[PDB]
Design a protein around this motif. Sequence first.
Motif, PDB file in Angstrom:
ATOM      1  N   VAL C 246     -16.616   6.498  -7.872  1.00 15.47           N
ATOM      2  CA  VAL C 246     -16.093   5.139  -7.839  1.00 15.47           C
ATOM      3  C   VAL C 246     -15.216   4.934  -9.064  1.00 15.47           C
ATOM      4  CG1 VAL C 246     -16.653   2.700  -7.619  1.00 15.47           C
ATOM      5  CG2 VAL C 246     -18.209   4.427  -6.691  1.00 15.47           C
ATOM      6  N   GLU C 247     -13.990   4.459  -8.811  1.00 22.66           N
ATOM      7  CA  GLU C 247     -13.000   4.147  -9.866  1.00 22.66           C
ATOM      8  C   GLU C 247     -13.352   2.763 -10.397  1.00 22.66           C
ATOM      9  OE1 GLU C 247      -9.186   4.387  -7.933  1.00 22.66           O
ATOM     10  OE2 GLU C 247      -9.539   6.427  -7.200  1.00 22.66           O
ATOM     11  N   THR C 248     -14.418   2.648 -11.167  1.00 22.90           N
ATOM     12  CA  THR C 248     -14.913   1.336 -11.645  1.00 22.90           C
ATOM     13  C   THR C 248     -13.811   0.725 -12.505  1.00 22.90           C
ATOM     14  OG1 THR C 248     -16.066   2.266 -13.535  1.00 22.90           O
ATOM     15  CG2 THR C 248     -17.323   2.113 -11.492  1.00 22.90           C
ATOM     16  N   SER C 249     -13.100   1.531 -13.293  1.00 22.55           N
ATOM     17  CA  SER C 249     -12.036   1.032 -14.198  1.00 22.55           C
ATOM     18  C   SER C 249     -10.921   0.372 -13.392  1.00 22.55           C
ATOM     19  CB  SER C 249     -11.481   2.128 -15.052  1.00 22.55           C
ATOM     20  OG  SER C 249     -10.721   3.036 -14.270  1.00 22.55           O
ATOM     21  N   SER C 250     -10.511   0.958 -12.272  1.00 21.04           N
ATOM     22  CA  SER C 250      -9.503   0.324 -11.392  1.00 21.04           C
ATOM     23  C   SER C 250     -10.078  -0.975 -10.842  1.00 21.04           C
ATOM     24  CB  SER C 250      -9.122   1.243 -10.268  1.00 21.04           C
ATOM     25  OG  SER C 250     -10.006   1.118  -9.165  1.00 21.04           O
ATOM     26  N   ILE C 251     -11.340  -0.948 -10.411  1.00 21.19           N
ATOM     27  CA  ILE C 251     -11.946  -2.138  -9.759  1.00 21.19           C
ATOM     28  C   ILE C 251     -12.045  -3.296 -10.753  1.00 21.19           C
ATOM     29  CG2 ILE C 251     -14.085  -2.989  -8.719  1.00 21.19           C
ATOM     30  CD1 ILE C 251     -14.416   0.145  -7.890  1.00 21.19           C
ATOM     31  N   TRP C 252     -12.525  -3.065 -11.984  1.00 21.52           N
ATOM     32  CA  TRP C 252     -12.528  -4.150 -13.007  1.00 21.52           C
ATOM     33  C   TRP C 252     -11.106  -4.516 -13.483  1.00 21.52           C
ATOM     34  CZ3 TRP C 252     -16.423  -0.420 -15.199  1.00 21.52           C
ATOM     35  CH2 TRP C 252     -15.893   0.453 -16.145  1.00 21.52           C
ATOM     36  N   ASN C 253     -10.209  -3.545 -13.714  1.00 18.17           N
ATOM     37  CA  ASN C 253      -8.860  -3.841 -14.276  1.00 18.17           C
ATOM     38  C   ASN C 253      -7.678  -3.304 -13.468  1.00 18.17           C
ATOM     39  OD1 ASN C 253      -8.361  -5.303 -16.852  1.00 18.17           O
ATOM     40  ND2 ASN C 253      -9.965  -3.957 -17.636  1.00 18.17           N
ATOM     41  N   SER C 254      -6.755  -4.159 -13.021  1.00 16.90           N
ATOM     42  CA  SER C 254      -5.443  -3.779 -12.423  1.00 16.90           C
ATOM     43  C   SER C 254      -5.589  -2.792 -11.264  1.00 16.90           C
ATOM     44  CB  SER C 254      -4.535  -3.257 -13.519  1.00 16.90           C
ATOM     45  OG  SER C 254      -4.945  -1.979 -13.990  1.00 16.90           O
ATOM     46  N   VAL C 255      -4.710  -1.787 -11.158  1.00 16.07           N
ATOM     47  CA  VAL C 255      -4.846  -0.656 -10.200  1.00 16.07           C
ATOM     48  C   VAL C 255      -4.740   0.574 -11.092  1.00 16.07           C
ATOM     49  CG1 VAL C 255      -4.052   0.393  -8.044  1.00 16.07           C
ATOM     50  CG2 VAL C 255      -3.689  -2.043  -8.448  1.00 16.07           C
ATOM     51  N   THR C 256      -5.691   1.490 -11.030  1.00 12.59           N
ATOM     52  CA  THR C 256      -5.755   2.652 -11.944  1.00 12.59           C
ATOM     53  C   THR C 256      -6.526   3.750 -11.231  1.00 12.59           C
ATOM     54  OG1 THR C 256      -7.863   2.447 -13.070  1.00 12.59           O
ATOM     55  CG2 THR C 256      -6.153   0.959 -13.830  1.00 12.59           C
ATOM     56  N   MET C 257      -6.433   4.982 -11.719  1.00 11.39           N
ATOM     57  CA  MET C 257      -7.282   6.063 -11.154  1.00 11.39           C
ATOM     58  C   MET C 257      -6.652   6.565  -9.860  1.00 11.39           C
ATOM     59  SD  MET C 257      -9.382   5.953 -13.547  1.00 11.39           S
ATOM     60  CE  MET C 257      -9.832   7.532 -12.829  1.00 11.39           C
ATOM     61  N   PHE C 258      -5.454   6.089  -9.512  1.00 12.02           N
ATOM     62  CA  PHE C 258      -4.717   6.607  -8.343  1.00 12.02           C
ATOM     63  C   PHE C 258      -3.537   7.370  -8.929  1.00 12.02           C
ATOM     64  CE2 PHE C 258      -6.503   2.714  -6.032  1.00 12.02           C
ATOM     65  CZ  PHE C 258      -7.436   3.424  -5.315  1.00 12.02           C
ATOM     66  N   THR C 259      -3.453   8.668  -8.664  1.00 14.14           N
ATOM     67  CA  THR C 259      -2.339   9.528  -9.132  1.00 14.14           C
ATOM     68  C   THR C 259      -1.148   9.169  -8.253  1.00 14.14           C
ATOM     69  OG1 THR C 259      -2.642  11.474  -7.758  1.00 14.14           O
ATOM     70  CG2 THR C 259      -4.062  11.307  -9.683  1.00 14.14           C
ATOM     71  N   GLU C 260       0.074   9.441  -8.683  1.00 15.86           N
ATOM     72  CA  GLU C 260       1.255   9.183  -7.829  1.00 15.86           C
ATOM     73  C   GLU C 260       1.108  10.056  -6.586  1.00 15.86           C
ATOM     74  OE1 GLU C 260       3.789   6.778  -7.986  1.00 15.86           O
ATOM     75  OE2 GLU C 260       3.787   7.583  -5.944  1.00 15.86           O
ATOM     76  N   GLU C 261       0.632  11.289  -6.738  1.00 21.17           N
ATOM     77  CA  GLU C 261       0.423  12.196  -5.586  1.00 21.17           C
ATOM     78  C   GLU C 261      -0.616  11.596  -4.643  1.00 21.17           C
ATOM     79  OE1 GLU C 261      -2.715  13.789  -5.167  1.00 21.17           O
ATOM     80  OE2 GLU C 261      -2.206  15.238  -3.605  1.00 21.17           O
ATOM     81  N   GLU C 262      -1.710  11.053  -5.171  1.00 23.04           N
ATOM     82  CA  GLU C 262      -2.750  10.368  -4.361  1.00 23.04           C
ATOM     83  C   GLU C 262      -2.157   9.117  -3.726  1.00 23.04           C
ATOM     84  OE1 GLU C 262      -6.076   9.615  -6.955  1.00 23.04           O
ATOM     85  OE2 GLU C 262      -6.793  11.683  -6.817  1.00 23.04           O
ATOM     86  N   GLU C 263      -1.350   8.377  -4.481  1.00 24.39           N
ATOM     87  CA  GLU C 263      -0.745   7.107  -4.015  1.00 24.39           C
ATOM     88  C   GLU C 263       0.176   7.420  -2.851  1.00 24.39           C
ATOM     89  OE1 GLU C 263       0.902   5.495  -7.622  1.00 24.39           O
ATOM     90  OE2 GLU C 263      -1.007   4.570  -8.185  1.00 24.39           O
ATOM     91  N   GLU C 264       0.915   8.515  -2.927  1.00 20.38           N
ATOM     92  CA  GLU C 264       1.865   8.916  -1.866  1.00 20.38           C
ATOM     93  C   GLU C 264       1.096   9.138  -0.568  1.00 20.38           C
ATOM     94  OE1 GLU C 264       3.800  11.738  -4.622  1.00 20.38           O
ATOM     95  OE2 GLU C 264       5.643  11.340  -3.496  1.00 20.38           O
ATOM     96  N   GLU C 265      -0.081   9.761  -0.587  1.00 20.97           N
ATOM     97  CA  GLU C 265      -0.916   9.980   0.588  1.00 20.97           C
ATOM     98  C   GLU C 265      -1.287   8.654   1.242  1.00 20.97           C
ATOM     99  OE1 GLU C 265      -2.348  12.727   2.559  1.00 20.97           O
ATOM    100  OE2 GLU C 265      -2.456  10.778   3.564  1.00 20.97           O
ATOM    101  N   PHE C 266      -1.646   7.657   0.433  1.00 23.14           N
ATOM    102  CA  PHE C 266      -2.033   6.365   0.992  1.00 23.14           C
ATOM    103  C   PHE C 266      -0.860   5.684   1.687  1.00 23.14           C
ATOM    104  CE2 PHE C 266      -5.428   6.218  -2.493  1.00 23.14           C
ATOM    105  CZ  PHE C 266      -6.353   6.803  -1.658  1.00 23.14           C
ATOM    106  N   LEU C 267       0.332   5.733   1.088  1.00 20.77           N
ATOM    107  CA  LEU C 267       1.493   5.155   1.764  1.00 20.77           C
ATOM    108  C   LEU C 267       1.780   5.881   3.072  1.00 20.77           C
ATOM    109  CD1 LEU C 267       2.683   4.993  -1.688  1.00 20.77           C
ATOM    110  CD2 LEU C 267       3.946   3.334  -0.311  1.00 20.77           C
ATOM    111  N   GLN C 268       1.694   7.212   3.062  1.00 21.75           N
ATOM    112  CA  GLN C 268       1.926   7.977   4.282  1.00 21.75           C
ATOM    113  C   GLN C 268       0.934   7.578   5.366  1.00 21.75           C
ATOM    114  OE1 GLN C 268       1.632  11.995   2.794  1.00 21.75           O
ATOM    115  NE2 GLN C 268       3.845  12.150   2.445  1.00 21.75           N
ATOM    116  N   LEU C 269      -0.341   7.441   4.998  1.00 16.01           N
ATOM    117  CA  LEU C 269      -1.351   7.030   5.967  1.00 16.01           C
ATOM    118  C   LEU C 269      -1.068   5.629   6.492  1.00 16.01           C
ATOM    119  CD1 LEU C 269      -4.144   7.892   7.250  1.00 16.01           C
ATOM    120  CD2 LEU C 269      -5.176   6.519   5.436  1.00 16.01           C
ATOM    121  N   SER C 270      -0.649   4.719   5.610  1.00 13.83           N
ATOM    122  CA  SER C 270      -0.327   3.366   6.048  1.00 13.83           C
ATOM    123  C   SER C 270       0.831   3.361   7.032  1.00 13.83           C
ATOM    124  CB  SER C 270       0.009   2.488   4.844  1.00 13.83           C
ATOM    125  OG  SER C 270       1.412   2.343   4.706  1.00 13.83           O
TER     126      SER C 270
END
Lengths: 212, 664, 426, 162, 300
Positions: C246-270
């Motif tokens: 669990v990316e607790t740091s992202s959940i408490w603050n802003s958006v974090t713990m998502f790599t650009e490579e990981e972020e790209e996968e989420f956009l592709q899935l969307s």
Amino acid sequence: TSTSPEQTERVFQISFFNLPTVHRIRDIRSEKIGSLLSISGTVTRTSEVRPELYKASFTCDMCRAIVDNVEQSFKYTEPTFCPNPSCENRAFWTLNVTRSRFLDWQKVRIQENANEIPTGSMPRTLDVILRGDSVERAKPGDRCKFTGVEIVVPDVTQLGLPGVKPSTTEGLNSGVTGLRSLGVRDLTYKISFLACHVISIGDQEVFLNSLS
Amino acid sequence: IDPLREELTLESLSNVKANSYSEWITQPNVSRTIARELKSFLLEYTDETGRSVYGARIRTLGEMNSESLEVNYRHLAESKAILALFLAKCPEEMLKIFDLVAMEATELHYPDYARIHSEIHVRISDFPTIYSLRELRESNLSSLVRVTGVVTRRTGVFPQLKYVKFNCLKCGSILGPFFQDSNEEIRISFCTNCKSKGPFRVNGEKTVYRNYQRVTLQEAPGTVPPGRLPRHREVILLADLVDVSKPGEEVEVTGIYKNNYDGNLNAKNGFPVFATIIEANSIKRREGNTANEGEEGLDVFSWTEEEEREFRKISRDRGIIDKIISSMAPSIYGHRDIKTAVACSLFGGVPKNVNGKHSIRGDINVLLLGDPGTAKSQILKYVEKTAHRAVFATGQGASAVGLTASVRKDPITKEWTLEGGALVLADKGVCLIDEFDKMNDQDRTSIHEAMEQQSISISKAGIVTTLQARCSIIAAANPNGGRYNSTLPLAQNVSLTEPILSRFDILCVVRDLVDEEADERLATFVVDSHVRSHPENNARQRRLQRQRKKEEEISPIPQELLMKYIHYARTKIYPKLHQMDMDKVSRVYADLRRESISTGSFPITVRHLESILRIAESFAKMRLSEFVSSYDLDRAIKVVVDSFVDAQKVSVRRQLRRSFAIYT
Amino acid sequence: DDNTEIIKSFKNFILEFRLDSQFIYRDQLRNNILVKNYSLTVNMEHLIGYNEDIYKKLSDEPSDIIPLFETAITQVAKRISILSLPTFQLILNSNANQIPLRDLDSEHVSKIVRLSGIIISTSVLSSRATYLSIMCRNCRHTTSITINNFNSVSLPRSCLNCGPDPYIIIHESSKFIDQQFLKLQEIPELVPVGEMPRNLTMTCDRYLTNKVIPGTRVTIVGIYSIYNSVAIRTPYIKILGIQSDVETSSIWNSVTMFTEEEEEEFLQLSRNPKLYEILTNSIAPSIFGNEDIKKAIVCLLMGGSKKILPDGMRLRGDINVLLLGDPGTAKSQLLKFVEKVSPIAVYTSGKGSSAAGLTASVQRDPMTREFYLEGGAMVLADGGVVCIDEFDKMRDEDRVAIHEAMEQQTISIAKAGITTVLNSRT
Amino acid sequence: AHALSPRTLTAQHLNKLVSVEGIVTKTSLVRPKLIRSVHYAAKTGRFHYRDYTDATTTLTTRIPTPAIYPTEDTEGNKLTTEYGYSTFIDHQRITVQEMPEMAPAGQLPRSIDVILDDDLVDKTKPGDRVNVVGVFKSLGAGGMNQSNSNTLIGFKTLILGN
Amino acid sequence: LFLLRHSSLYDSFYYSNYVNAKLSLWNENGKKRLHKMFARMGIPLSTAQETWLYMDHSIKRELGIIFDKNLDRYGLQDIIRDGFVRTLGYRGSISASEFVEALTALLEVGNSAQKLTNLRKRWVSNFWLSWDALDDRKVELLNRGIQLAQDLQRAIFNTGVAILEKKLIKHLRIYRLCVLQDGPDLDLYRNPLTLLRLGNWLIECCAESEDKQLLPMVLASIDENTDTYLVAGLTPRYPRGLDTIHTKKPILNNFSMAFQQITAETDAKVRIDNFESSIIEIRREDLSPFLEKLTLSGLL
DNA sequence: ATCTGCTTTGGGTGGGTGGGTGGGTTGAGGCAATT
DNA sequence: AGCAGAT
Ligand SMILES: Nc1ncnc2c1ncn2[C@@H]1O[C@H](COP(=O)(O)OP(=O)(O)OP(=O)(O)O)[C@@H](O)[C@H]1O
Ligand SMILES: Nc1ncnc2c1ncn2[C@@H]1O[C@H](COP(=O)(O)OP(=O)(O)O)[C@@H](O)[C@H]1O
Ligand SMILES: [Mg+2]
Ligand SMILES: [Mg+2]
Ligand SMILES: [Zn+2]
Ligand SMILES: [Zn+2]
Ligand SMILES: [Zn+2]
């Protein structure tokens, strides 16, 4: 079968009963301390049987000497002078539980019978100490008749115990002082009992043998 | 010849030449002779069969990487009486010698076992004399005792120092390590070299630790006189014995009764009274085994390497699945369906977690809904006797939190904590609820989650946790009005509701009907049983032989062997469904649903489709078979379909039986 | 003597370790010093590959060698960032077998262990000393001490006449670090038969603080040690690394713990034309039918959007779902799946719950005799989903205690002096 | 970057001027604190004085001074304390709690202890929203004295308000 | 031993063809015997189950001494061998056998006539994964191959256990037969390589040993998606590491000739296009006539 | 006669292998019995 | 600081 090595000396107990008179709890005074009498009361609480040190046996920490038959007062007692002339130990000893003799010990709390309580008065209480084979002969709720010796038990905390730090009546219960062991503290006392007798007022072949 | 290496003989060992037994045992030559005799006893002892007991016990010990060799007191007493006497009177030194010799015997079989465990602890199994916590006196001090009680309080496991090393504050010299007695602390007052009265600091370069735990034993309610308060003692469990016992459980503790000095006790009592504790040497779980007291060993549901080479002959035979059903409560005349359901529940199904996302229950629940004098409570008592872990509860004697788990405020830490109830004590076991229909509704609704999800969820006083309750429920109930009315549907004859009913895999309705031939057989069997059980109807060997002869008359399999067999099957066998007629099961499920659409009928849901497979897995387990066979599935289908049909009304029972004759 | 050689060996690992053409640890150090993160995460498989002897020392005596690997890191960092900085933290990663929480015993004292569990509580940060400045009461002599937080330290007993314990700390010249305490409970499945789950106390330092929240599964690398609080010691684990799903740091603050490579996968899935169908089918693959309830569960997991109007009114953005039905419908299984898919979730039974068990409860500290507040199911599930099973068995009062937290998303308390309005957005 | 809240105050900020915002949840009672005592020697006919300091009455570390009033002069004269000329100041301790609405997800709000002396003694009551400026400090030995055997307890900390 | 340097010392013994053959690990007595062996060798069970890299180094160094005295007693003496180990600076060392195992695992599970063509295209695709794994710049592929190899060996062990427990092997006078119809993991054996892996496992256990006469074995598997069998004749093997004049002579595989003869004589519909002539494809309803004619042929 | 050394109040800057018949006493929350 | 002990 085998030769038993552990044959110590029996620790006899003398029990007396059938005294001319029986005293109530409220009639216990300080004039009879150290005397033999009987009392009657209804038990209310009973402690658990513990081993009580009777004839302690120590060994000198340095020369390995031995001390036997060290009579024990109300508090833990150790020898003050080694029997070895060359030795200089005076206040250093270690107990030896193998040679020490222990006695059974139970504390019974009793209170005066209901019919003897003056109307609208809280009951009096006392603490009785049983030993040896007279242990567990009194169950709570029974109306017993103890026969023993009325004693006074010192406050052992003041007298000085190994590893113990010392320490109704609005400060008027002042004890006696001036003893060597009591540096600047006082010794207060309590009335207790030492019963030596207890009476509770309130397969074919085996059965036949019992009958006359 | 070195005098220190000479040895006496056994008869020369019986005659004592010291002032105390401890000093007699501690002598060099005597100790050498005792060690030699103990080694000879371990190597040479043979039971009736004639094969070494302790060679096999050592081989299994090494197999499991354990550090405990269980020794029977009776074997030692028969082989060597004087050694048994010494162990009884002076347990500490004798146990030390017996641990050394046991390690030497174990290293005989596994030459390098010192690299797994450094020491082996000998455990005494059956001490002949049993005391209560009220019967302990001064004469028992420093001697082996055996007591029973209830573990009312437990502490966490702390690593204790096996050897303590001290260094002088002033001189700075470091004294050699000294053995630590768990009973009381060790202190050094007179330094050998410095000879300084000042304290010596506690420090050490390297130390070895051992596990330490303390439990508060309390008198069991069964033994304490009625209405009186219970005594208690404190037991010290050293390494390998920690966590064996859990709160709320009966136990049989064998250990050493020891006393030490306590300043506070002397200060409060006013007399020089010492504090006493027990140093545990073995533990035997007495919970739910009141009817197994006639049995040797610290575990009565464990097996040798020869008893499981035969649990596997008994089980290849062709009719074990039915000789097992016969051996269920043989002292009850009939009730074949009840016995079959009880056997199925005892063996139980196989839990399965599909892909780590889907959890499926793997235990079978049974409900007995019958007439007054129809041997239900007796069946429950038998199941309590036979199961590995069982708890018995009665209708209004159980509470919502008595079952499951409760929340209390710890007297010591004054902080909220969680206690385990009946279902926790019955984890991987059976919870037997009698007078099920008289329970409070609030208490009855409490077991809903545990009966299906196998877990208890508690959200109370800041605690949010989920437990595990992998327990099967066998419940006995009484129909409305006290007697089953076969003219009405089942739903009208019981006050339970659909959700609770749907959780019971097997429903067994029992009726008492006056048939003269049926009454004739039952009375004959009952009177013959009463004749058989009459008390009047080597010594131990003769007693065992007569008991075996009496038992053989009514049970094809010995009850103790059956207990061990059930435990072995539940531990080591996990049958798996590979080859099955899907169409048969689907078609019987659809038929059951369609026929159960009728109002007031016994509920049918997917739970029962899964119950069929659970019962099939149980039948496969009864044979110690690794794969479910077609015969097992057919038998399970028959069981479920019959149990469904019997519950129908008289008017439609004949039609239903004719319609379902294909599967039965 | 040997300490300098050990320090030299760990400094050569950070300066000579290349797996191909990139110096992994030299570059990791420079990149960390540039963003003000004074630490280095080292994988123990790489150290076993450079020199197995260095691993043998770090595993044989962990609390003596770890302090000497920190100073090597600090020296290399000074050489790399300063052209002629506190002591650097060492975070360890390992793939050794995990020891069950309850299997830790005397055989593992003062050794590196790996284990998993559930975090049930976290403490308020404390301050530990790392560099004391001291002075003498009588002669006023100034000195300093340096402390590493690895126990097997106290002020000098004799001055450098001055009575015993002559030194008093000068606080305005000392330096401190952060310390936190965590309670670790064993996983529900690992627990043995008929046993309550067992706890274990843990402590973390500096950059390993504020990394977890109660109720999250974590994996821990640390040292199983003991501290004296008779001849028994209370065990605890000195954390050397924390890994969580669990990316607790992202959940408490802003958006974090998502790599650009990981972020790209989420956009592709969307961008998938039929993501709705995939998500609906992905919930409870083992439960047949009930498509509408699965779509509802997708919507509940997704949540709406919350608005704060200018006048101050807040509009709830969460969705609440009730499943009423007959037995055997697979409602409990759906709840148990939703508890397992959601980032934050708590599964509770309405029967085994209470008004204080949900929401928050007032508790008294036995030492300070002071009342404080402890969060319940709805606080422990804040920002997630609460699965209240057996909702009909809950008592009337315990059910009534849920209205405000379900609608207004706040838990008003007025008990034992404590007066507050917590936040429960579940 | 010194504008913080009780949750964001960490050991990195010790010995620095910070501003903290939150809710006042507690407020101790106001008790005078001895700073200076003035005595009179009747025979010598001259006044003397003594200065006392504590960890919370000053920003620089000094030797502690027990509150025992001097009784005898340097030469052995009897000393009588003159309370009307001595100096006592008020002293209060309050607790400031993090705003509940600004807390993280699933975490209860935290608090910090503050000291107010002299004219800042009764400027706040529980339930008030305040912004406190002061110096973040540490006190005591923090377990470095051999009396405490814990070895895992940190130092006390708090703010001297300005 | 199976992947000694990438798994625990326990798993290497448990999932080894030779060890299972010489100890019969598929039943409980085999597990008991293996635990006895580990206890005798002086290796704690916890230590053995630890992964290779983090295992206690004293035992790792002494393994050669501990194995040599202990193994002969359990009949596992031939485990001792000399092989090739290759190391790249600061990386884990890998042996030739484990490299080959990783490559084969990548080939096997790396990832009417239409489905057959699709399957063959997928295998041609896997060829390139295995080819890439040969380059030192691609080490993630090799690690992925080792993981897949461990998975595949676990699956083969489970399937062999299911085959032996049920006694599905029919011992005819000309050969042994084993046909899988309802296994749990039957999708795996469409690849000839995985089928040959299972065949080798069976050939070693309870066929190489037991002092039984050397008899060739036939192994077949079904796939519902195409309703056909993948038969595979397998040559027998002499007891491993037993040098002898008869063991010196090689044993040939005659199944190609008999299979071709029967296919030509009967209207078999057999596909004999595979390069290994011992492996063919049969329709669901022709296997019984085919095997009857095989038994009656006598040329096996 | 002088030098060396421990421990309070009562309280969590001693604790829970010292307990609550050695005192620190209201507030909240869970459970059985009473309804 | 008062009192308890060793040289
Ligand atoms: N598709 C399915 N539909 C229904 N039940 C299923 C399905 N798949 C599995 N099950 C079984 O459902 C059982 C779980 O019970 P379920 O969650 O259906 O109960 P519920 O209806 O929510 O509860 P209750 O019966 O107390 O009202 C498990 O045994 C699981 O095997
Ligand atoms: N079928 C039977 N076989 C043997 N004994 C029976 C049978 N049915 C009833 N009994 C007798 O009934 C008694 C137990 O009745 P019980 O089962 O306790 O009643 P309930 O069913 O109400 O619990 C036992 O003494 C038992 O011998
Ligand atoms: Mg009954
Ligand atoms: Mg449900
Ligand atoms: Zn002496
Ligand atoms: Zn010395
Ligand atoms: Zn000085």
